[PDB]
């Protein structure tokens, strides 16, 4: 049930009928990832190393 | 307008704080085949590459949180173990894409044996309280003389929500997200106001709250699309109309500030700008009343008040008036 | 600067309006192997996953419209069936990435048997009309005394385009996109002005149009890179130079506001900031004339007018002047 | 043919020679999607279900 | 606040300039199996599709530069052949994701036989010079009377860095990126100031530099999260507290502007807004002193100076004071 | 070594101890790309043509 009122005297309008959902706080959780046809496995294991490497680069100094 | 009144915060200060703790306990403990197999590995590794991709282009802090960072299943699990209201849980479950937009993913540590990142989820401590959106547009005189026109604009536009005996005011309504009749907002982009701030809507000259306005002599035309209609501020020689999709133009606005509801109206044209009105269902009320800009004398009206108020503009007029009255004598 | 004068609209109000109609007729009718096979399915499904990916991280409304949402072929088909000019069609075909940037994709319904979303394409009703971009920079005095300097800045900078007997003015030139000599803009981010607004360029003290300026005493240095050169506002003790790539510094600016064209100039340095000038080909004209800031007396100059105009600043001076003249007597 | 003029008197410059392409309206079209080695088909059909599921979640309440 | 004082530049003017040269020499010379094989092709082509994907949704200009545009290996190679300091090289190698964020990829030519695009990398000519971040918040009176309160706010907040005998000032601290104690900034978003600008911190009424402030009568409450603590501007009836995570509320702020360090403080609440303080390690110093807002008489205080300064506000008071003193006689 | 000072008299705070890394210039380099189970090669060669085609479309007029 959304309604609206216009005020000619002040050139403004109010839309009512809304319900709030305001972020007031934070919930922090910690996510962990466990790290360590045959040819197909090879290119995927290489992809893995670029990902670990790339992550190692952003976590530098 | 009043977005510059907002405070300044650190958005990931909580997650980063958690991240710093995982480093500490790191040092604290630092003291004395089959094709089904090929498919599962590509599925699992794909996700790692995507997580890595997002972190690498966002310098380790991502928002929104992707399904790669946190799948719908993992997210729902989190939601279930949060100490929150079942309605808070239910709210988050039905709006998971929004929760996602309000979450951060912060890269933390990668020890060669374990990869860890902190997920910062929003918690909504205020739910199902009434909200209202205030729309404002410049109010100028309907004077025939070209220059020397006076204008007035309420600057207190934005979302207002009941919150803990006060009102959370969002000056940048853009910070709020609307899903049907639900308003998703971040309190970090808000001011906390007394409930008396609402008096500016009914009586702009009221003593309990000092209603905010800005003044100018720029009588330029524009329109503000509201929830259920459109405000049209038409001044000078601007062509301002309201049209229906099948029928065509159904209303021509005269000089001044007017309004049309979206019921049976599809578009609004002000000058060279075409606006589509919102088509949401709901009732509109037109409250007649004299434009308060007519109560002012253009000769003593302070026409460059960027951040003033009704009483503040008025008191500035009295000072200018006092300068005159005590002169002739 | 004058972006705050712009109206407020609902960008997807038209597509959402269409979306709401598809729900209605939903209820209205709701009344009484091979490897080539494997490849085609992954190709088709990939697209579904990408569409889903975009919708899920943008909460169901995406912009720009990806080739996943709408392939180049589907887009061109749409363009061909729009009731538009062949030049409007041809415009869109040669700039499909821009059309894409100006389009929205809005998630609508997913009945278990059919998935539907609305694509909102831009239609360009104004093509091949002359546009001009106005660049402005602070104009201050070249006074030897440290504080007490007066400044003036035209605030009406941005894109101007002929449009329907008027001029569409884009205060935030950032809203415009430039491809060679073509200017892609959105009328939603514009004001509609009389063609007399151009008089401010030739005669800033003209009576037909009240040219907009802001005043201050902050005589800080900066540069504005134009289309074919660079404006340099150099004040105080700032080092301001113009350089060539092979030859080095080829011009040193004195205090005041000056300009150098990009022909033979590669960079401009103002203080600690290095600017690369635009290298586009075209002719530049230097129009000599006394800085109007010199015509003002720093003692009665209103030095904090955020949104004023030439005549408005002048009339404010007369009021201050009248206060004096009628005093000694 | 792009030209530019600088006005020393007001510290401003005008670049002329451009042609307009202003969005003035919208064209709305409705796009519909029809919904319903062997092991490879299985993981793709599962991908399909996450997509339908994910879309079903955003279209909630 | 003072972001509007910044100059205007063309960000890809240098790369586009290079792009235009590749067209010229184009016309200048224009004058009289195995599975390992399948895998390598998909790997190489994937990259082409991703590069194409990025260019097609960004209209040919991308930022940040992805690993698809430029792999970590290619980037490091570039860094090694730049004529720069080994510390500049080392800086870039340890912060490759940031370098990436500050780079542009600009699509240039695609002759049917060769595809070429220009990569615009940042070069950091200023390294290891001291930087400081200035945080400011509104300073208002602690008066019992409701309306008629006076306020003052330093508007010169942002990052300051030593640079070539001057100070590069970044009005929008948001343009700066912080990694531990390293501040990554773009000089394009800065002003060049005399080193005397720092005097505003120790003596705001000093004659050598005219410290910038804004005035108002809007005594609204807010907080600014700093590097090592939190500033709380608490006025009116606002509830302002500082809390610890395990212990709870550990400090309640009175009306006025105060500060708490982050050592042992986890959060700060001002009104309905909860702020998490930054948890970085470092020492905080509280310098006691009377709020200068108390030195002003609210009756002659210019309460709507958007861009003024200490001496400028003061001189405006003297003019108002002179109007009075020479009247009674 | 990061420190911070709060000034009660002017409601402001200074955080010191940071080191600069300011972008002052640009380094431009030019990147070039050389252009030209069996069924699998076919769909990849088609992908190639959409990429060349898509790039040809953005470089239009």
mmCIF file of N, CA and C in Angstrom, chain E residues 133-177:
data_model
loop_
_atom_site.group_PDB
_atom_site.id
_atom_site.type_symbol
_atom_site.label_atom_id
_atom_site.label_comp_id
_atom_site.label_asym_id
_atom_site.label_seq_id
_atom_site.Cartn_x
_atom_site.Cartn_y
_atom_site.Cartn_z
ATOM 1 N N UNK E 133 47.504 12.525 6.262
ATOM 2 C CA UNK E 133 46.101 12.609 5.914
ATOM 3 C C UNK E 133 45.425 13.511 6.917
ATOM 4 N N UNK E 134 44.751 14.541 6.425
ATOM 5 C CA UNK E 134 44.048 15.450 7.315
ATOM 6 C C UNK E 134 42.557 15.114 7.389
ATOM 7 N N UNK E 135 42.068 14.838 8.596
ATOM 8 C CA UNK E 135 40.646 14.595 8.801
ATOM 9 C C UNK E 135 39.979 15.778 9.480
ATOM 10 N N UNK E 136 38.831 16.219 8.972
ATOM 11 C CA UNK E 136 38.105 17.330 9.595
ATOM 12 C C UNK E 136 36.625 17.005 9.816
ATOM 13 N N UNK E 137 36.012 17.666 10.790
ATOM 14 C CA UNK E 137 34.620 17.419 11.123
ATOM 15 C C UNK E 137 34.057 18.754 11.610
ATOM 16 N N UNK E 138 32.726 18.964 11.484
ATOM 17 C CA UNK E 138 32.097 20.241 11.845
ATOM 18 C C UNK E 138 32.315 20.611 13.290
ATOM 19 N N UNK E 139 32.662 21.870 13.541
ATOM 20 C CA UNK E 139 32.851 22.338 14.903
ATOM 21 C C UNK E 139 31.779 23.356 15.253
ATOM 22 N N UNK E 140 30.861 22.969 16.138
ATOM 23 C CA UNK E 140 29.728 23.828 16.490
ATOM 24 C C UNK E 140 29.720 24.106 17.985
ATOM 25 N N UNK E 141 29.020 25.165 18.375
ATOM 26 C CA UNK E 141 28.778 25.426 19.779
ATOM 27 C C UNK E 141 27.899 24.463 20.577
ATOM 28 N N UNK E 142 28.093 24.540 21.889
ATOM 29 C CA UNK E 142 27.623 23.574 22.874
ATOM 30 C C UNK E 142 26.496 24.289 23.613
ATOM 31 N N UNK E 143 25.892 25.238 22.905
ATOM 32 C CA UNK E 143 24.749 26.014 23.378
ATOM 33 C C UNK E 143 23.454 25.257 23.563
ATOM 34 N N UNK E 144 22.783 25.694 24.618
ATOM 35 C CA UNK E 144 21.587 25.133 25.219
ATOM 36 C C UNK E 144 20.390 25.560 24.373
ATOM 37 N N UNK E 145 20.463 26.747 23.775
ATOM 38 C CA UNK E 145 19.360 27.263 22.971
ATOM 39 C C UNK E 145 19.331 26.406 21.698
ATOM 40 N N UNK E 146 18.130 26.088 21.214
ATOM 41 C CA UNK E 146 17.955 25.161 20.090
ATOM 42 C C UNK E 146 18.543 25.667 18.784
ATOM 43 N N UNK E 147 17.861 26.616 18.159
ATOM 44 C CA UNK E 147 18.352 27.165 16.916
ATOM 45 C C UNK E 147 19.437 28.155 17.279
ATOM 46 N N UNK E 148 19.863 28.935 16.300
ATOM 47 C CA UNK E 148 20.916 29.922 16.490
ATOM 48 C C UNK E 148 22.253 29.406 17.053
ATOM 49 N N UNK E 149 22.784 28.339 16.457
ATOM 50 C CA UNK E 149 24.012 27.695 16.927
ATOM 51 C C UNK E 149 24.929 28.080 15.819
ATOM 52 N N UNK E 150 26.193 28.278 16.130
ATOM 53 C CA UNK E 150 27.139 28.494 15.071
ATOM 54 C C UNK E 150 28.100 27.340 14.818
ATOM 55 N N UNK E 151 28.464 27.146 13.551
ATOM 56 C CA UNK E 151 29.300 26.020 13.179
ATOM 57 C C UNK E 151 30.449 26.474 12.304
ATOM 58 N N UNK E 152 31.489 25.653 12.269
ATOM 59 C CA UNK E 152 32.688 25.939 11.508
ATOM 60 C C UNK E 152 33.304 24.626 11.075
ATOM 61 N N UNK E 153 33.752 24.515 9.832
ATOM 62 C CA UNK E 153 34.376 23.266 9.417
ATOM 63 C C UNK E 153 35.557 23.546 8.533
ATOM 64 N N UNK E 154 36.703 22.973 8.872
ATOM 65 C CA UNK E 154 37.845 23.070 7.988
ATOM 66 C C UNK E 154 37.549 22.268 6.738
ATOM 67 N N UNK E 155 37.732 22.887 5.577
ATOM 68 C CA UNK E 155 37.362 22.259 4.313
ATOM 69 C C UNK E 155 38.576 21.687 3.581
ATOM 70 N N UNK E 156 39.760 21.841 4.173
ATOM 71 C CA UNK E 156 41.015 21.459 3.531
ATOM 72 C C UNK E 156 41.454 20.032 3.855
ATOM 73 N N UNK E 157 40.490 19.174 4.174
ATOM 74 C CA UNK E 157 40.779 17.770 4.450
ATOM 75 C C UNK E 157 41.220 16.990 3.220
ATOM 76 N N UNK E 158 42.044 15.974 3.457
ATOM 77 C CA UNK E 158 42.565 15.118 2.403
ATOM 78 C C UNK E 158 44.000 14.704 2.649
ATOM 79 N N UNK E 159 44.606 14.087 1.646
ATOM 80 C CA UNK E 159 46.011 13.684 1.709
ATOM 81 C C UNK E 159 46.947 14.809 1.313
ATOM 82 N N UNK E 160 48.064 14.906 2.014
ATOM 83 C CA UNK E 160 49.110 15.863 1.688
ATOM 84 C C UNK E 160 50.393 15.069 1.524
ATOM 85 N N UNK E 161 51.141 15.352 0.466
ATOM 86 C CA UNK E 161 52.423 14.688 0.280
ATOM 87 C C UNK E 161 53.542 15.620 -0.139
ATOM 88 N N UNK E 162 54.711 15.492 0.483
ATOM 89 C CA UNK E 162 55.844 16.258 -0.013
ATOM 90 C C UNK E 162 56.176 15.879 -1.418
ATOM 91 N N UNK E 163 56.387 16.900 -2.228
ATOM 92 C CA UNK E 163 56.611 16.677 -3.628
ATOM 93 C C UNK E 163 57.316 17.886 -4.201
ATOM 94 N N UNK E 164 58.604 17.732 -4.497
ATOM 95 C CA UNK E 164 59.359 18.747 -5.226
ATOM 96 C C UNK E 164 59.351 20.141 -4.587
ATOM 97 N N UNK E 165 59.528 20.225 -3.273
ATOM 98 C CA UNK E 165 59.600 21.515 -2.616
ATOM 99 C C UNK E 165 58.231 22.066 -2.268
ATOM 100 N N UNK E 166 57.195 21.424 -2.796
ATOM 101 C CA UNK E 166 55.828 21.825 -2.495
ATOM 102 C C UNK E 166 55.076 20.679 -1.863
ATOM 103 N N UNK E 167 53.763 20.834 -1.787
ATOM 104 C CA UNK E 167 52.933 19.777 -1.261
ATOM 105 C C UNK E 167 51.829 19.451 -2.261
ATOM 106 N N UNK E 168 51.732 18.188 -2.623
ATOM 107 C CA UNK E 168 50.639 17.757 -3.450
ATOM 108 C C UNK E 168 49.473 17.470 -2.526
ATOM 109 N N UNK E 169 48.373 18.169 -2.757
ATOM 110 C CA UNK E 169 47.203 18.057 -1.909
ATOM 111 C C UNK E 169 46.054 17.372 -2.638
ATOM 112 N N UNK E 170 45.563 16.292 -2.032
ATOM 113 C CA UNK E 170 44.474 15.494 -2.591
ATOM 114 C C UNK E 170 43.178 15.679 -1.794
ATOM 115 N N UNK E 171 42.314 16.587 -2.285
ATOM 116 C CA UNK E 171 41.087 17.052 -1.634
ATOM 117 C C UNK E 171 40.090 15.929 -1.458
ATOM 118 N N UNK E 172 40.116 15.001 -2.401
ATOM 119 C CA UNK E 172 39.301 13.799 -2.352
ATOM 120 C C UNK E 172 40.166 12.617 -1.927
ATOM 121 N N UNK E 173 40.322 12.400 -0.615
ATOM 122 C CA UNK E 173 41.219 11.370 -0.063
ATOM 123 C C UNK E 173 40.857 10.008 -0.657
ATOM 124 N N UNK E 174 39.658 9.946 -1.231
ATOM 125 C CA UNK E 174 39.119 8.771 -1.895
ATOM 126 C C UNK E 174 39.948 8.446 -3.158
ATOM 127 N N UNK E 175 40.648 9.435 -3.706
ATOM 128 C CA UNK E 175 41.443 9.205 -4.907
ATOM 129 C C UNK E 175 42.726 8.444 -4.534
ATOM 130 N N UNK E 176 43.098 8.484 -3.253
ATOM 131 C CA UNK E 176 44.292 7.791 -2.737
ATOM 132 C C UNK E 176 43.982 6.343 -2.311
ATOM 133 N N UNK E 177 44.952 5.451 -2.491
ATOM 134 C CA UNK E 177 44.837 4.045 -2.099
ATOM 135 C C UNK E 177 45.818 3.672 -0.962
#
